[PDB]
Symmetry: C2
Subunit: 129 residues, 2 copies
C-alpha cells in the first residue's frame, strides 16, 4: 500500500476493528472514514484493492452481502481465491453491509471504481500487537 | 470522473487555475490540495488518470518536465496522443514542476501509483 490515508487507517487498527472496501455506487458517509480511490468506471477494480489491502492486514473475518451469491458469483469466487481457508466468511443482508459503514469500530471506508453489483466487503481485524 | 475530491476541485476551477497529476514518488505537500489515488505499484496508471481528467476539463496548456523527453520518451508520446493539437505543451525543469505543487492557483495535486520517471503533469485551465 502506497495510499497514505489507508496506511493511516491500518495504523489505527486493532482487534475487532473494521475496514471496508466498496464499489462505486455504495453510499459511503461523508466523514473522516471516507477514502475515495475511484478514478473512473472499473478503475481501480474492487478485487485489486482488496488484494492490496490483505497484504497489509491480519484479518479474522470478512463480511459480504448475501446477495453476492446470486448477483455476482464471479466476484464471490475471486474473493474466496484470495483469502485463506483460515478466514471465516459471514454473509449478511446488503442493507446490513450499508449500516456497517457507520459501525463504531469502522476505521475506514474505501471507495473503488468497481461497477459490478455487491462488490463490497468488510474486513475484521485480528489482534495486531 | 467518479472521484469526489477531483470533482470538487474541478468545480472550483477557473481560468488560469492549475490541477496536477503525479507519479507515486512526487513529493506532494500534505495539505487540502492533496488527492491520493495511489493503490499500489502502477495502480492506477498516470496515463489513465490523465485521460479521465481531460474528459472533464477545458485545458489551455500543460506543463511537463524537460527531463521527460530523454528519461521517459514513452510517456511523452502517450501524453501527446491524448491531448489535442490546440493545446500547448510547455517544458520546464522537473525542479519547477515540484515548485508548482504549491502554486497559488493550484487547485489540486493528484497522486497516482505510477512508477515510471517524470510522469507528472500540470494542467492549466481555460475559461470555465
Amino acid at each position: 500500500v502506497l495510499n497514505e490515508h489507508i496506511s493511516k487507517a491500518i495504523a489505527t487498527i486493532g482487534h475487532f476493528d473494521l475496514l471496508t472496501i466498496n464499489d462505486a455506487g455504495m453510499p459511503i458517509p461523508n466523514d473522516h472514514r471516507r477514502i475515495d480511490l475511484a478514478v473512473t468506471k472499473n478503475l481501480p477494480r474492487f478485487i485489486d484493492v482488496l488484494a492490496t489491502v490483505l497484504e497489509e492486514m491480519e484479518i479474522q473475518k470478512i463480511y459480504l452481502a448475501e446477495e453476492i451469491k446470486e448477483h455476482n458469483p464471479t466476484q464471490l469466487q475471486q474473493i474466496k481465491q484470495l483469502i485463506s481457508s483460515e478466514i471465516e466468511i459471514i454473509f449478511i443482508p446488503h442493507e446490513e453491509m450499508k449500516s456497517n459503514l457507520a459501525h463504531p469500530l469502522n476505521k475506514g471506508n474505501i471507495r473503488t471504481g468497481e461497477t459490478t453489483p455487491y462488490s463490497n466487503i468488510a474486513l475484521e481485524s485480528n489482534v495486531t500487537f
